[PDB]
From Swiss-Prot:
The lineage of its organism: Eukaryota, Metazoa, Chordata, Craniata, Vertebrata. Keywords: ATP-binding, Cytoplasm, Deafness, Disease variant, Hearing, Kinase, Non-syndromic deafness, Nucleotide-binding, Phosphoprotein, Transferase. GO terms for cellular component: cytosol. Changing R221A: Reduces enzyme activity by about 99%. It comes from Homo sapiens. The C-terminal acid phosphatase-like domain binds PtdIns(3,4,5)P3 and InsP6. Despite its similarity with the phosphatase domain of histidine acid phosphatases, it has no phosphatase activity. The chain holds residues 42 to 366 of 1243 of the full protein. This is Inositol hexakisphosphate and diphosphoinositol-pentakisphosphate kinase 2. Substrate binds at K12, K13, R172, K173, K207, R221, S285, F286, V287, K288. The modification Phosphoserine is found at S182. Bifunctional inositol kinase that acts in concert with the IP6K kinases IP6K1, IP6K2 and IP6K3 to synthesize the diphosphate group-containing inositol pyrophosphates diphosphoinositol pentakisphosphate, PP-InsP5, and bis-diphosphoinositol tetrakisphosphate, (PP)2-InsP4. PP-InsP5 and (PP)2-InsP4, also respectively called InsP7 and InsP8, regulate a variety of cellular processes, including apoptosis, vesicle trafficking, cytoskeletal dynamics, exocytosis, insulin signaling and neutrophil activation. It is found in: Cytoplasm, Cytosol. ATP binds at residues 93, 146, 153, 172, 196-199, 205-207, 223, 268, 280-282.
Length: 325
């Protein structure tokens, strides 16, 4: 029989252009059949009624019942491409930075301010006009303030008096803007946050997209922190700049993919002071608008499935060579 690869995520993701392009290419594998779980089934049917698969590609996004995906995987024991329990930890920026540190990965200097929503002023924060002290640790402006929830994209940057003060407020893109300037110089007074050193870059972020530990595509984009105007092409897509990862960065990608157990994994690098710092790990993420990535991603994933499962199914398989980029 065919090896069945099940795709389990919200319809917004499962029906996205990149997903559709990659799935049509995985389907080209002679012994692989792809089954995409319907969103109504995922949300409304008990896991005992979900389709069977031998290999499961499943990932959390807004609205996804991760509890059910975990229960399905426990019930059916498929080969899991992106580990489901790690996807709880990826939702918490504190847990992400904790894992990165354990792996010897360079990250910005940071401190966590945990607030009790009933006792909001009893926390360990002291504010001056050009710095904050968080659990005794001093962060001079500029510094970055991130909600402890990785799904909350309201990241603020605070400017020093020498630069005119105020703050830059970042958010999920709304049309032509990714951030806005605020005259507010004081930090947020409710909620829990990570405070971290601002890393000076050339004004771009590097986005890295892994497909297993030995393949990573990278590209750069204008930092939303810069002025907040999105650069769009005549075709309406955000402008992306070419990047080739150096040896240190290729190792970072290997470590991130393995430490979070996410075969398909997006993360962000800040190229600053002659080194590269990880500032965000997002988990499952596909490159958009690269045909070569579609081809490579589908081949690599298909090959992983065949490597793992072909012996079980008595299918002959000789392990092929793959690009690292
Ligand atoms: O990783 P993914 O594939 O899940 O997508 C992420 C994010 O990628 P990231 O995690 O590496 O930052 C995308 O940013 P990009 O890389 O395309 O610039 C963003 O697209 P966007 O803001 O619409 O960008 P535009 O199309 O307006 O240019 C998208 O927002 P939504 O589609 O509106 O939900 C996000 O989904 P979610 O996190 O659920 O909000
Ligand atoms: N420590 C830092 N130093 C300099 N820039 C930073 C720093 N931390 C975050 N940034 C910038 O702020 C942007 C958003 O922060 P990030 O941690 O990526 O938030 P996010 O909400 O998880 N964004 P997303 O990539 O959509 O998941 C980054 O892309 C950088 O441009
Ligand atoms: Mg097929
Ligand atoms: Mg995500
Ligand atoms: Mg959007
Ligand atoms: Mg990011
Ligand atoms: Mg993120």
């Amino acid at each position: 029989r065919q090896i069945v690869v099940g795709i389990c995520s919200m319809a917004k993701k499962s029906k996205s252009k990149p997903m559709k392009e990659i799935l049509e290419r995985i389907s080209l594998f002679k012994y692989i059949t792809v089954v995409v779980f319907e969103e109504e089934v995922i949300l409304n049917e008990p896991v005992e009624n979900w389709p069977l698969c031998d290999c499961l590609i499943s990932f959390h996004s807004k609205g996804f019942p991760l509890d059910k995906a975990v229960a399905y995987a426990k019930l059916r024991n498929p080969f899991v491409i992106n580990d489901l329990n790690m996807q709880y930890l990826i939702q918490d920026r504190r847990e992400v930075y904790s894992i990165l540190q354990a792996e010897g990965i360079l990250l910005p200097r940071y401190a966590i301010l945990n607030r009790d929503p009933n006792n909001p002023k009893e926390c360990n924060l002291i504010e001056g006009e050009d710095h904050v002290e968080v659990n005794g640790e001093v962060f001079q402006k500029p510094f970055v303030e991130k909600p402890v929830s990785a799904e909350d994209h309201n990241v603020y940057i605070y400017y020093p008096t020498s630069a005119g003060g105020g703050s830059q407020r970042l958010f999920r893109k709304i049309g032509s803007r990714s951030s806005v300037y605020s005259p507010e110089s004081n930090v947020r007074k409710t909620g829990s946050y990570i405070y971290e050193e601002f890393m000076p870059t050339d004004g771009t972020d590097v986005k890295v997209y892994t497909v297993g530990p030995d393949y990573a595509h990278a590209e750069a984009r204008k930092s939303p922190a810069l002025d907040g105007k999105v650069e769009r092409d005549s075709e309406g897509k955000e402008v992306r700049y070419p990047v080739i990862l150096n040896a240190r960065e290729k190792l970072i990608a290997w470590k991130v993919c393995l430490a979070f157990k996410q075969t398909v994994c997006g993360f962000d690098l800040l190229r600053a002071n002659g080194q590269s710092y990880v500032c965000d790990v997002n988990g499952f993420s596909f490159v958009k608008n690269s045909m070569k990535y579609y081809d490579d991603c589908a081949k690599i994933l298909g090959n992983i499935v065949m490597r793992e499962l072909a012996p079980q199914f008595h299918i002959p398989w000789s392990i092929p060579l793959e690009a690292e980029d």
